[PDB]
Amino acid sequence: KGCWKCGKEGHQMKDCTER
């Protein structure tokens, strides 16, 4: 659904600002 590490779970992992 949301991210994989971001507990917030709202955006997409692909677009996640992990970098």
Q: Please, which of residues 1-19 interact with Zn ion by CB under 5 A?
A: 3, 6, 16
Q: Is 15 left (phi over 0), alpha (psi -120 to 50) or beta?
A: alpha
- Residue closer to Zn ion (CB basis): 1 or 16: 16
- In sequence order, the 6+-apart residues with CB closer than 8 A to the CB of 5 are 16, 18
Q: How far is the CB of 19 from Zn ion (least distance, A)?
A: 11
Q: How far is the CB of 17 from Zn ion (least distance, A)?
A: 7
Report the interface residues with Zn ion, using CB under 5 A.
Answer: 3, 6, 16
